[PDB]
From Swiss-Prot, chain B:
Keyword terms of this UniProt record: Phosphoprotein, Ribonucleoprotein, Ribosomal protein
One Gene Ontology CC term in the entry: ribosome
PTM note: Phosphorylated.
GO MF term set: structural constituent of ribosome
Similarity-based family: Belongs to the eukaryotic ribosomal protein eS6 family.
Gene Ontology BP annotations: translation
Family matches, as PROSITE patterns: RIBOSOMAL_S6E (PS00578)
Lineage: Eukaryota, Fungi, Fungi incertae sedis, Microsporidia, Unikaryonidae
Superkingdom of this protein's organism: Eukaryota
Disulfide bond sites: none
Protein name: Small ribosomal subunit protein eS6
The organism of origin for this protein: Encephalitozoon cuniculi (strain GB-M1) (Microsporidian parasite)
Gene name, Swiss-Prot/TrEMBL: RPS6
RNA sequence: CGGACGGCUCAGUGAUAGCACGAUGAUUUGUUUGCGGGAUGAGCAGUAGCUGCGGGAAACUGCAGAUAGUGGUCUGCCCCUGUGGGGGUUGGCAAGUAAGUUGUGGGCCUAUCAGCUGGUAGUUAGGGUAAUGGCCUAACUAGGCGCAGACGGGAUACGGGGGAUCAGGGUUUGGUUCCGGAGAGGGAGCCUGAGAGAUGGCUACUACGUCCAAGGAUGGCAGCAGGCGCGAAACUUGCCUAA
RNA sequence: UUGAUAGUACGAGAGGAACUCUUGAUUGCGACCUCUGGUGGAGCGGCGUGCCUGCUGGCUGCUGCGGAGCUACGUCGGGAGUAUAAUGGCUGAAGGCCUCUAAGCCUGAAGACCGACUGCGCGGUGUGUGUGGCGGAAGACGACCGCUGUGUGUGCAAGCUGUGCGGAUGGAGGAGGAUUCCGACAUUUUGAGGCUGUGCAUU
RNA sequence: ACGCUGCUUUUUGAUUCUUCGAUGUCGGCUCUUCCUAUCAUCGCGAAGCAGAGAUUGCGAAGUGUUGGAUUGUUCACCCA
RNA sequence: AAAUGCCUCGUCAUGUAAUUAGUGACGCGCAUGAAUGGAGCAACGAGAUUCCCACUGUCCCUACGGCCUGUCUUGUGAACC
RNA sequence: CGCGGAAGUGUUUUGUGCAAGGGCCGUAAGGGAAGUCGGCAAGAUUGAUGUGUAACUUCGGGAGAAGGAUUGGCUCUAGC
């Protein structure tokens, strides 16, 4: 069971291990540890820390959202309209 | 989550339905991420499906270009999924979802890319009707192959058979006249001009 | 194509507004008038209505199918050049109408208001603009205003055309038909368009709110009637395809 | 203490309960470390002052994160046993009637005793202890729990820190004929290097 | 009411038996134990006890009885 | 009602949720008062008082860590009573 | 001066490894003087350079009033 995803490092958090912090606008950010809440307090940008996932795809080490999924598909059968069901052109 | 599957080649749709044991395999997939159909149930085996959209439990639609699982509120304009614009130059802030499946989506829209060896009932059997027939004359000629100078393109097809055939016949004739007298007037303006140049240059 | 006009109001503003006489050789202008000007070539993409499957309490919205207008790219055409090349895609001229920018001059009261001013005064260069200009920036000079009242502060301050009083000379007043300005609860920022910093347009913060199945969605009478409140203090929720 | 009982009984009205069932807590007592928080002179990093001739690498100072262990601000856990007091009752004389009382009997308390829970002496029994050494879950020293060569070292697993030296390609600019030199720092090789008292294997 | 009879040792007096070759003299803070003449909690009577809320009495000492402002205060007096 | 007022925690106002404290005002003042010096605070003070901001293990309520002692060994080896 | 180095000078080589309680120190969630006779103790401010500075006053002062901002490394420009 997962509690959620860390909003600073991008990693999965196990069930029962984070602290939600609600802001004055009603936005509730989830962090894993005091190693991460400190980097937010000092106002560091996560892309300058090499063990986060937003830093690995900024430098191209590995993209975090794979897409294509091999998608090799084509077909174009022809059909009829109202009475020309057998066109035969 | 009830599924809404369509087979574009035969042009047909129907509303399917699945349970929450196979449903959990769909999570963390983008729009345009597609797979083998056997995951969903049983009859879908050997097929290649595709994801194209979906709603949530409050009606809001999923759109591409966001890459999140939460609900956002951008400023949208004319020609944008999620907005249906009526006044000219107006923009609206309206909520949508991101392009990733999770436990919030109520309905998924799919696409049968390659059918299977089995026979899904309402999709692999029927072959539905087209809705409109072309109107451009080059496209009409390539549909039936009428290249014999085409001489009268509609009358040629009316004999080959009742289906009524509409076409851009009149529109070609208006514009044919408009740029025929416009050449007529270019000659008068120029011709009447050089008379005065010489007659003016005569006296002075 | 139009909804930037028409209609309502007088919060702000004591001169950056308004009236009078000037400059634009420093600028743009749809509709109106008279002249000029105009791709019937190739080759691919692809949409509204329409035909089906649907979501949501709502307000609103998605996916598949197939078609006009249409959008790219070549070809040609045009523009600046040429003993190389590089751009653009048909956008014009002159009147008329409208709009923007700018010079000088005028009796609201007050010295228990006498010295005021840092983009402040100027030069030289560039940027931005439809266009001149500290309008904006870089460098450098030390200027500019004042008892002929500067700089401040007050009162029920929208300016004129106008009104009242009445021998003459004067005193008082103008929210209000016509012309000019400014604003749409309060501040800001913008899109479309010939023209708006528009509110019977959009986006945010802020005053007061309204509807919900609770997760969301929404409001702008200083338009014509009408209601509440306030106060000494002010009309009809009527009829109109006629002028 | 919440909900139900119940807007019910009672009352002209206004007002307005109880037995039984049910929900959460406050405080005391006894434990425990999975989670969260604190500490962490273990470990890794950053930035400095002096000294080793400079770079590399060290020692010294301030600072970020911080495993194990300890801990609370964190988590867990409570008899329907017997006889009675006040009071209320049964049978019943003295006193032909009456009366809970003089003989007897029934009921009844956060109280009494007992149980459960912890400690000590004394008994019984087909029953009498590893000298020394080395470890720990135990410990001021004695004692207690274990084995009787299975350690140490190393590898893997599981974690903490955060991208090592050297090279290559760049760098605000400056110096000047060589197409050279000086330069904080950047990207890449590289989730990389360093470290571990915990677990498994082997020697 | 007017009168009359008791108990305690928490007040303040009365006295001068012990200690002047010395028994550290007020309050607070900390910590333990005992009394009942019971404030609350458990059981049960009376009524000028309809219900609700209180008032008065008996059995009962197991468990509880707080946080602050002003004063050195004990004491006092207000707030929650 | 002052470092001077017995009665006395005088009376009224103000600061607090709550003021035997502080400040302002009142005056028949047990027993104020003029070089026994009276009134008066600019500047100066490790002088005496009351309140505000800031800050914190003072406290709610304690925890964990460092070094030297103590605990254990050898040597030297007292005193009070 | 403080925080670190020379010169000169002084110095040993078979005790243990750390219970409770002490003496001198370090770090602490959330609260922020509720603690106490009393903010005792600790924490907090701190160098330099622009900015901005009131009541009162013996006109000298008050004044560093209060309040706000800046600060490393590297590579250059300007003045004398």
């Amino acid at each position: 069971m997962i509690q959620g995803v860390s909003m600073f490092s991008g990693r999965n958090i196990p069930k029962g291990s984070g602290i939600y912090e609600v802001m004055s606008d009603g936005r509730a950010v989830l962090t894993a540890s005091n190693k991460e809440r400190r980097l937010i307090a000092r106002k560091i940008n996560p892309r300058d820390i090499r063990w986060t996932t937003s830093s690995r795809e900024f430098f191209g080490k590995e993209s975090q959202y794979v897409v294509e999924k091999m998608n090799v598909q084509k077909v174009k059968v022809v059909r009829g309209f109202r009475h020309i069901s057998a066109s035969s052109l | 989550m009830k599924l809404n599957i369509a087979y574009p080649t035969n042009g047909t749709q129907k509303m399917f339905e699945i349970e929450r044991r196979n449903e959990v395999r769909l999570y963390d997939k983008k729009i345009g991420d597609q797979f083998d159909g056997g995951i969903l149930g049983e009859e879908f085996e050997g097929t290649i499906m595709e994801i194209t959209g979906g709603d949530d439990y409050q009606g809001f639609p999923m759109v591409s270009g966001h890459l999140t699982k939460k609900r956002v509120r951008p400023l949208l304009s004319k020609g944008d999924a999620g907005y249906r614009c009526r006044r000219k130059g107006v923009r609206r802030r309206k909520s949508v979802r991101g392009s990733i499946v999770s436990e919030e989506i109520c309905v998924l829209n799919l696409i049968i890319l390659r059918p299977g060896e089995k026979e899904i009932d309402g999709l692999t059997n029927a072959v539905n009707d087209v809705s409109h027939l072309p109107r451009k004359e080059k496209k009409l000629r390539k549909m039936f192959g009428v290249p014999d100078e085409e001489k009268n393109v509609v009358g040629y097809i009316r004999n080959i058979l009742i289906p009524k055939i509409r076409h851009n016949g009149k529109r070609m004739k208006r514009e044919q006249e408009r740029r025929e007298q416009i050449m007529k007037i270019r000659l008068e303006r120029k011709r009447i001009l050089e008379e005065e140049r010489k007659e003016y240059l005569e006296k002075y």
